[PDB]
């Protein structure tokens, strides 16, 4: 029973996406034990925190909060600007389009309200996530953010979010963008931003992968290299390996096979002996999720189906992948 955070404690913070029925049961013991960094899931999306412009939903992230507090871990605050699960109030005005300056001042608003109550436990924001495009040539993705405020947006999240944050570090988040086509669109917007003055800290790698990746470990290293050259932090943000290929949508598994649960303990391994190595750039590495028994790759990209992509087994056990990443010594 050695604790994943205490083993990783000098190299960096070690965190799980939650929501408040993980305080409960197996899940509440293995986040006080292994744990000491905390996202919220849902809780602190625009959308689910703020649904109306003058309503709030304060009590989940709350209760986040105060479990955070009262077992002596930090939050990761995500997400303030994201293309989804952004409420319509906030770009409608009465029967048209809000104009931009509508759009940034109740962009304003949001972040003073939601990073003044929590500032006092998060240690990082995802400022703005999955910003730049994925699936064309363009850099940026197109989203109502985009659309409104312009491509200054990105800077201009990030400027009031500073304002409010303390010394809280800002991360811009992303998928995939450990991989060639994406890692380089991202220096390039990433380079121009820090050349603009905009106050980011550091590039959240999302790190949803699999254990068929042949390129993984060399996309990771040559990212986290690529990022640190910018003068940035890397936070591995949404970590999980799951057993199947992206494009692999078969459901018919009720268990991994043993090549899954084997190549599985060997990637995470890997990952974790990368993370390690550049310790001097990474400064948390957060989990999607604690156990199998509750993980959103269950219904992504196919509904209703099961996957094993985490660290602790669907009965809460710590898997092989666990004791192959505490192995080492400092």
């Keep these: 029973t050695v604790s994943l955070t205490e083993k990783y404690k000098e190299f960096f913070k070690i965190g799980a996406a939650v929501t408040v ?79 931009k300056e509508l759009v940034i001042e109740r962009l ?9 109550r929590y500032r006092d436990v998060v240690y990082s924001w995802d400022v703005v996530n999955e910003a730049v495009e994925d699936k064309t040539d363009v850099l940026l993705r197109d989203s109502k953010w985009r659309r409104i405020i312009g491509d200054d947006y990105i800077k201009i999240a990030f400027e009031i979010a500073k304002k409010y944050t303390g010394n809280g570090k800002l991360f811009y988040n992303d998928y995939n963008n450990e991989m060639p086509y994406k890692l380089e669109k991202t220096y390039k917007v ?39 050259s910018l003068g940035l932090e890397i936070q591995i943000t949404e970590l999980d390996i799951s057993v199947f290929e992206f494009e692999d949508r078969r459901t018919d598994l009720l268990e991994p096979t043993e090549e899954m649960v084997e190549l599985q303990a060997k990637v995470y391994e890997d990952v974790f002996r990368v993370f390690r190595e550049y310790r001097d750039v990474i400064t948390s590495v957060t989990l999607w999720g604690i156990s199998d028994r509750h993980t959103w790759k269950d219904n992504f990209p196919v509904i209703g189906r099961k996957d094993w992509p985490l660290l602790f087994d669907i009965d809460g056990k710590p898997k092989k992948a666990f004791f192959r990443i505490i192995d080492f010594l400092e």
């Design 21 to 99: 029925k993980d305080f409960e049961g197996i899940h509440g013991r293995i986040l006080t034990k292994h744990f000491n960094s905390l996202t919220p899931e849902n809780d602190m999306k625009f959308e689910r925190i703020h649904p109306k412009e003058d309503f709030y939903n304060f009590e989940a992230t709350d209760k986040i909060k105060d479990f955070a507090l009262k077992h002596n871990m930090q939050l990761r605050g995500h997400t303030l600007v994201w293309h989804n699960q952004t409420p319509e109030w906030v770009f409608r005005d009465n029967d048209k389009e809000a104009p």
């Design 190 to 228: 990433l380079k121009s931003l820090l050349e603009e003055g905009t106050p980011i800290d550091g590039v959240g790698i999302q790190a949803h992968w699999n254990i068929w990746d042949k390129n993984l470990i060399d996309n990771l290293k040559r990212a986290i290299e690529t990022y640190a």
């Design 108 to 116: 304003r608003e949001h972040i003073k309200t939601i990073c003044t």
